[PDB]
Amino acid sequence: SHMDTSILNLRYESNHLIDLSRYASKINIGSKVNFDPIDKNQIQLFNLESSKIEVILKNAIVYNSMYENFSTSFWIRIPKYFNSISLNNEYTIINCMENNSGWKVSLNYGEIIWTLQDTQEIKQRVVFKYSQMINISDYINRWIFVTITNNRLNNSKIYINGRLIDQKPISNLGNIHASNNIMFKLDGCRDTHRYIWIKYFNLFDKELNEKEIKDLYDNQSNSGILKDFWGDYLQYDKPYYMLNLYDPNKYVDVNNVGIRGYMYLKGPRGSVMTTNIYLNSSLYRGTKFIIKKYASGNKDNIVRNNDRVYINVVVKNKEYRLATNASQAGVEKILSALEIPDVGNLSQVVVMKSKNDQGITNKCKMNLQDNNGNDIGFIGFKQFNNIAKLVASNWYNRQTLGCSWEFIPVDDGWGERPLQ
């Protein structure tokens, strides 16, 4: 029933970053652009002149109008601001301004900004602002879906993860004559170590509606592959610190290895800080988990939705197996960290599931099964005489955030120094 409204669809395909739209606009990649080795649609731009991508627009789609509606969408991952040199330093990242008219995306401390300017210097801005004084952020250093829409008779709107954040009137702007090119480059950034990650840039020749935006968000989320906390693909054989979303100020520890010990949650996490710049919960706490292949026949190390795996727990630089004896009384089966040669017939197979909904991105569930494939239940926790022990429980399966987890690898955009 439809029309392709995407007039620029920038994707990595067949070994190159290209425009997939009918216009096939030309792409000039600079010499210091980094691509993620696992997902080549993920592009890293540094604070360097050669870290840039320029799109040469076909003339038919250069914006020069008093009336035409248009939108843009992309994903971005912005490292934590670390130093006061980033306060009050708006810097352009996606530039389609020519002679002070056009559009641009810029960033500032805790901000993503869209600016429109007409040929008579009338401007409007729409702004997403996120805090760095917050225990756990949905936004700092995590993949964010941005969508900006513009209706020349009323409002410009910015959406984040499919949700409307800010809307401002633009009907007083006259002719907007944008650039013949789009420059993806950090422009005016005083922090020499600043960078961004970006992916899936699109332009559209209409004002996208809410349904269209949510569909783009769901589609581009790649729900077939599980994600880590930052929004990158979850991997096998990669150590992760654990976050339980129900109890986000607690971390995972072990009270003795073996079948008479147990895994548990304890807190508080403690804080990471730079005065006036950030104050957040420490993320590099507790015993690391490593996801191990069991049933998957894919020969990459990406964790897919519904993969059956084992979970190893790292204690003193040695791996143990997360397991339980499902015969123990009561619905909740307490998890222990076992010597791998000693697991025997104990329950240890975990079904990994992505959980995509309207809350924080990148949630994962872990359904423990016995050796006949019967569900023992989702991994969460249960308070036993004031100790929050990790359990597998079919109580979750009949119905929450107690059984929702995120996997946090060390990342330079977070900047925390592990204690050990």
Numbering used by the authors: 872 to 1270, 1277 to 1297
Task: Give the authors' words.
Botulinum neurotoxins are the causative agents of botulism, a lethal paralytic disease, but are also one of the most commonly used therapeutics for the treatment of numerous neuromuscular conditions. These toxins recognise motor nerve terminals with high specificity and affinity by using a dual binding mechanism involving gangliosides and protein receptors. The ganglioside-binding site is a pocket built around the strictly conserved SxWY motif on the carboxy-terminal end of BoNT/A14. Three HCA mutants, Y1117V, H1253K, and Y1117V/H1253K were characterised using ganglioside-binding assays and X-ray crystallography.
The same is true for H1253 with one exception: mutant HCA H1253K displayed a 1.5-fold increase in binding. Unexpectedly, the H1253K mutant displayed an altered oligosaccharide selectivity where the affinity was reduced for GD1a and maintained for GT1b, while binding to GM1a and GD1b was improved considerably over wild-type. This single point mutation seems to favour recognition of gangliosides lacking the terminal Neu5Ac and the interaction with the Gal4, thereby changing the carbohydrate preference. Binding of GD1a to HCA H1253K could not be detected, suggesting a loss of affinity for GD1a compared to the wild-type with a KD clearly above 1 mM. It should also be noted that the structure of a H1253K:GD1a complex could not be obtained despite crystallisation experiments carried out in similar conditions confirming the decreased EC50 of HCA H1253K for GD1a. The high-resolution crystal structures of the HCA mutants in complex with the polysaccharides of GD1a for Y1117V and Y1117V/H1253K, as well as GM1a for H1253K were determined. Single mutation of H1253 to lysine affected the ganglioside selectivity of BoNT/A by presenting a significantly higher affinity for the non-sialylated Gal4 epitope of GM1a and GD1b compared to the wild-type and Y1117V mutants. Additionally, the crystal structure of the H1253K:GM1a complex shows that the long K1253 side chain can reach the centre of the carbohydrate portion of the ganglioside via hydrogen bonds with the central GalNAc3 moiety. These results suggest that successful variation in ligand selectivity may be achieved by targeting this sub-site of the pocket, by engineering additional favourable electrostatic interactions with the GalNAc3 moiety. In the case of the single H1253K mutant, Y1117 seems to impair GD1a’s Neu5Ac5 access to the binding pocket.
